[PDB]
Write an enzyme that holds these catalytic residues in place. Structure first.
Site, PDB file in Angstrom:
ATOM      1  N   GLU A  92      46.980  56.879  44.218  1.00  0.00           N
ATOM      2  CA  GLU A  92      47.059  57.167  45.842  1.00  0.00           C
ATOM      3  C   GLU A  92      46.517  55.824  46.540  1.00  0.00           C
ATOM      4  O   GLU A  92      45.596  55.247  45.887  1.00  0.00           O
ATOM      5  CB  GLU A  92      46.543  58.369  46.165  1.00  0.00           C
ATOM      6  N   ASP A 140      29.109  51.202  37.802  1.00  0.00           N
ATOM      7  CA  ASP A 140      29.452  50.233  38.538  1.00  0.00           C
ATOM      8  C   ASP A 140      29.491  50.921  40.079  1.00  0.00           C
ATOM      9  O   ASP A 140      30.353  50.230  40.912  1.00  0.00           O
ATOM     10  CB  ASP A 140      30.430  49.418  38.301  1.00  0.00           C
TER      11      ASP A 140
HETATM   12  C1  LIG Z   1      43.369  50.779  49.089  1.00  0.00           C
HETATM   13  O1  LIG Z   1      43.876  51.599  47.926  1.00  0.00           O
HETATM   14  C2  LIG Z   1      43.143  51.395  46.912  1.00  0.00           C
HETATM   15  C3  LIG Z   1      43.475  52.370  45.796  1.00  0.00           C
HETATM   16  C4  LIG Z   1      42.841  52.093  44.708  1.00  0.00           C
HETATM   17  C5  LIG Z   1      42.072  50.984  44.427  1.00  0.00           C
HETATM   18  C6  LIG Z   1      41.263  50.750  43.325  1.00  0.00           C
HETATM   19  C7  LIG Z   1      41.268  51.531  41.997  1.00  0.00           C
HETATM   20  C8  LIG Z   1      40.606  51.175  40.811  1.00  0.00           C
HETATM   21  N1  LIG Z   1      39.716  50.124  40.679  1.00  0.00           N
HETATM   22  C9  LIG Z   1      39.910  49.382  41.656  1.00  0.00           C
HETATM   23  N2  LIG Z   1      39.122  48.194  41.435  1.00  0.00           N
HETATM   24  C10 LIG Z   1      40.568  49.405  42.822  1.00  0.00           C
HETATM   25  C11 LIG Z   1      41.657  49.959  45.373  1.00  0.00           C
HETATM   26  C12 LIG Z   1      42.633  50.115  46.677  1.00  0.00           C
HETATM   27 CL   LIG Z   2      29.477  46.646  34.882  1.00  0.00          CL
END
Ligand SMILES: COc1ccc(-c2ccnc(N)c2)cc1
Ligand SMILES: [Cl-]
Ligand SMILES: [Cl-]
EC number: 2.7.11.23
Length: 330
Positions: A92, A140
């Site tokens: 999403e 994290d």
């Molecule tokens: C702006 O929408 C999003 C959705 C998921 C993520 C996301 C999801 C999982 N890991 C990272 N590092 C970033 C970033 C922006």
């Molecule tokens: Cl880490």
């Protein structure tokens, strides 16, 4: 190299770069099947990143199979597929992260009332991850990994399970971002879900003051900044710590003290009471007179944070009991 207009698999039209990570990159894309925008996390085509991302996919799918109220504080993985030898995770779309929110206050912090809303959502997320059959350690938590659902609203979700592991599936001893790293990890001890609660304590003080609670430039500095606020860690913990002697020295009578290098406030003298400005109009006196920033409001917050910053991971407050704290009452 992904270009705007690029079409994948007669399904996704790439729009733009949302963000870059150690793991790879995240792009904004249009999904023609669902007719909606999605965030596509594109993992680098290198064994290391692929293997760790395969763990992120497994942990997200594991959570998705648990339909309950508390699972809706975690970014939703819609699906994953392999393309041009890159693992691709479709999420999403969320909005901007809580670091950006802090940068937008010019690092002066949000209200105790918005902090409470973030606290309560994050405590619910951690209660969900602690579900026995999940037992997921994020590993994290930091402001950057907490995203607004909507730029108009105060709903949040946790992202980035790239470091995450189940209890008893630990890979790395060196984990968590330094500012948010728990004492047990600094001390090289086997870690459990309590390291996320330590991070959360750090995060909520930062959201309200605008600055990191413990901004160590390295592990020695990090432990020294923790000791300034919280004192020397209890002997029973230091006795069982492999890396105790990276930071402390055992004496025959009067067990532990800081190792001193070249010239920090005395142990436990940088009081959270003063950092929060409990009796002095909040951080830098900037909340003097504002509603929801009474001394009684402040003392409740201080108490919850000191419970979240217990040195002992077995007595540190757990999510269910954090949700019952007076800070969240009426
Ligand atoms: C702006 O929408 C999003 C959705 C998921 C993520 C996301 C999801 C999982 N890991 C990272 N590092 C970033 C970033 C922006
Ligand atoms: Cl880490
Ligand atoms: Cl930060």
């Amino acid at each position: 190299i992904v270009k705007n207009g690029e079409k994948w698999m007669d399904r996704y039209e790439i729009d733009s770069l949302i963000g870059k990570g150690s793991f790879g990159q995240v792009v904004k894309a249009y999904d023609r099947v669902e007719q909606e925008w999605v965030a596509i996390k594109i993992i680098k085509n290198k064994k290391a990143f692929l293997n760790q991302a395969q763990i992120e996919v497994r942990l997200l799918e594991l959570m998705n199979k648990h339909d309950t109220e508390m699972k809706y504080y975690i970014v939703h993985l819609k699906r994953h597929f392999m393309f041009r030898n890159h693992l691709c995770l479709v999420f999403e779309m969320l909005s901007y992260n809580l670091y950006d929110l802090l940068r937008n206050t010019n690092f002066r912090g949000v209200s105790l009332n918005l902090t409470r809303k973030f606290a309560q959502q994050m405590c619910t997320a951690l209660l969900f991850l602690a579900t026995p059959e999940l037992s997921i350690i994020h590993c994290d938590l930091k402001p950057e990994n907490i995203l607004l659902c909507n730029p108009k609203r105060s709903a949040i979700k946790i992202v980035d399970f790239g470091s995450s592991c189940q209890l008893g599936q630990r890979i790395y001893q060196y984990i968590q971002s330094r500012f948010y790293r728990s004492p047990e990890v600094l001390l090289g001890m086997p870690y459990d879900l309590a390291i996320d609660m330590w991070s959360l304590g750090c995060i909520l003080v930062e959201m309200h003051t605008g600055e990191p609670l413990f901004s160590g430039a390295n592990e020695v500095d990090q432990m020294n900044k923790i000791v300034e606020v919280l004192g020397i860690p209890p002997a029973h913990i230091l006795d069982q710590a492999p890396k105790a002697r990276k930071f402390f020295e055992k004496l025959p009578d009067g067990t532990w003290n800081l190792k001193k290098t070249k010239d920090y406030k005395p142990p436990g003298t940088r009081k959270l009471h003063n950092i929060l400005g409990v009796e002095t109009g909040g951080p830098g006196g900037r909340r003097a007179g504002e509603s929801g920033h009474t001394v009684a409001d402040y003392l409740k917050f201080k108490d919850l944070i000191l419970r979240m910053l217990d040195y002992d991971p077995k007595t540190r407050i757990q999510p269910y009991y954090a949700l019952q704290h007076s800070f969240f009452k009426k």
